[PDB]
């Protein structure tokens, strides 16, 4: 517990940019794009106000649009007088992927018609399209093969406080070890993580901070409408924060919370507000109406595990169940606890052979061991129970491909 | 029940079945079969013939049967076993786990085939487990797959009975003969014997 991420003060004008959303849509061969930026303000509207959105490729301005406030009519009462949407044509855009993380810079200026800046906000923009078509997850029209890992935010001295050096260490080691993707198990991460993933190139599953695993049954809260409001803010406030990062390619509704009607409501809410990214969620059997991707945890390659209600089929068999058409990407597989990863090659051979097996996220990146000191002041790696915590789950906190200090297993 | 249409030795295999010249002759092979046999409850599927590539004549006759008799699926394996002229993915000699990625007409692993992007049909092999001589090695691998995968709905072994013929030696004693034993040439020798049973119905 505690105040474990940054604290800041931000001084904005009273007439201010209060939100902006950046979308990029493409023609059939990605030779042309439109960047559409919706910009919202708070404060006092004045007829001399304007917004300009400009797009930069390094030091060169490649596109720009300027308009006064006042959006299109949307219903019988008019439109948003406090919004405007800029549309920028971009010819032959450099496309973003984990392979080549090409980025542009978008600068959003709130200014006056005669040239005075009120304030500016900005983001890195990666031109890429994510869509599911004919059962395949496509990035810029090509089917992804996710070499993923789940990564919790953990440091053996600082607990759950993340810092730039440790983030960078982790991304370098991930890419050096042929990972291209990370799942934010199981919550939104420190804001710097997405900047780093945008710039170094990793595909990100951004996951709402909702896990109710110890309820019986697992969906007791997520099926209860009285919990829809609290759940809703965990999803909606994540999308409002992170929706402009190109590295985020998939939203997840949380983890191990069964499947309840609140899931279906929030699945639909994201699909409404952001059609640019698939939504996944594994709870309730991994192939429910709240997920665009079959996303099981620890389904095996050839062996079925036919549990009541929530079976984990062989991933090869799952793809072809009667009526099923979705891609399958394991949200967790290959549990790397202690001396493990036996069988890892069997997954990769299947992922290469079956178009719709589009990979998975290993569980997990780093052991959650914590440093304690003995009588002599010498450090040692501690696990569950070592702090007098009880009940505890002992060494199950260490499931990493690397030790807590980032040494490889 | 399968129409008497096979043009395997054409090059390419569909040279006649894509030729509207040959649409009349093929049409009567299909239509006169359905007119004869459509009251039999044992017929559950119609087939448009065998090893004749995939031609437009197949698509015309597929839809003729779908129109006249909605009570039975139509299948046909030619042209890669999963064309627009078949309601059932019906490959011949597709293997259980191993792909054979032939150009144009690949034989995928049957487990892979079911889940190719956009595919939803059942798969029943029109021919599998070629029982020539000392064979049926790997038979159990098919059955384990058929039982594990709902949409792998089985197959037809190739085939029931050896096509050996009886000849008589200089003493009048009978012996089983195969391709070329009648002075027939060119011939394909013992390939005519692929059965689970010998020609006299003794089991292999
Ligand atoms: K694949
Ligand atoms: K664990
Ligand atoms: K079956
Ligand atoms: K033969
Ligand atoms: Mg300017």
Swiss-Prot record, chain A:
GO MF assignments: beta-galactosidase activity; carbohydrate binding; magnesium ion binding
Active site: 256, 332
Binding site for substrate: 256, 332-335, 399
Record-listed Mg(2+) 2 binding positions: 392
Coiled-coil annotated spans: none
GO biological process: lactose catabolic process
Keywords: Glycosidase, Hydrolase, Magnesium, Metal-binding, Plasmid, Sodium
Residues reported in the UniProt entry to bind Mg(2+) 1: 211, 213, 256
Marked site (Transition state stabilizer) residue numbers: 152, 186
Residues that, per the record, bind Na(+): 396, 399
GO CC terms, sorted: beta-galactosidase complex
Subunit structure, as described in the record: Homotetramer.
Family membership noted in the UniProt record: Belongs to the glycosyl hydrolase 2 family.
Name of the protein described by the UniProt record: Beta-galactosidase
């Amino acid at each position: 517990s505690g105040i474990f991420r940054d604290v800041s003060l931000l001084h904005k004008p009273t007439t201010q940019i209060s939100d902006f959303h950046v979308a990029t849509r493409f023609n059939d061969d990605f030779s042309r794009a439109v960047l559409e930026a919706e910009v919202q303000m708070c404060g006092e509207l004045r007829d001399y106000l304007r917004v300009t959105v400009s797009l930069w490729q390094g030091e060169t301005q490649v596109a720009s649009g300027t308009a006064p406030f006042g959006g299109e009519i949307i219903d019988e009462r008019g439109g948003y007088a406090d919004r405007v949407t800029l549309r920028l044509n971009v010819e032959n855009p450099k496309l973003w992927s984990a392979e080549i993380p090409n980025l542009y810079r978008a600068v959003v200026e709130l200014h006056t018609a005669d040239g005075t800046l009120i304030e500016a906000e900005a983001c890195d923009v990666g031109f890429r399209e994510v869509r599911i078509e004919n059962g395949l997850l496509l990035l810029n029209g090509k089917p992804l093969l996710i070499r993923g890992v789940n990564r919790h935010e953990h440091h053996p001295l600082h607990g759950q406080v993340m810092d730039e050096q440790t983030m960078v260490q982790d991304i370098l080691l991930m890419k050096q070890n042929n990972f291209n993707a990370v799942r934010c198990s199981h919550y939104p991460n420190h804001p710097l993580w997405y900047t780093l993933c945008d710039r170094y190139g990793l595909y990100v599953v951004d996951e709402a901070n909702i896990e109710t695993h110890g309820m019986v049954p697992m969906n007791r809260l997520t099926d209860d409408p009285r919990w829809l409001p609290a759940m809703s803010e965990r999803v909606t406030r994540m999308v409002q924060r992170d929706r402009n990062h190109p590295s985020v390619i998939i939203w997840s509704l949380g983890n191990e919370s069964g499947h309840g009607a609140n899931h279906d409501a929030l699945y639909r809410w994201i699909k409404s507000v952001d059609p640019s990214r698939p939504v996944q969620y594994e709870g309730g059997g991994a192939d429910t109406t709240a997920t665009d991707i079959i996303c099981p945890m620890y389904a095996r390659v050839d062996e079925d595990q036919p549990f009541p209600a929530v079976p984990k089929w062989s991933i090869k068999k799952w793809l072809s169940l009667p009526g099923e058409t979705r891609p399958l990407i394991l949200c967790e597989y290959a549990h790397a606890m202690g001396n493990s990863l036996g069988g890892f090659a069997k997954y990769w051979q299947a992922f290469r052979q079956y178009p719709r097996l589009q990979g998975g996220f290993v569980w997990d990146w780093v052991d959650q061991s914590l440093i304690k000191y003995d009588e002599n002041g010498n450090p040692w790696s501690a696990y569950g129970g070592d702090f007098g915590d009880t009940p505890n789950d002992r060494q199950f906190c260490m499931n990493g491909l690397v030790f807590a200090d980032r040494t490889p297993h």
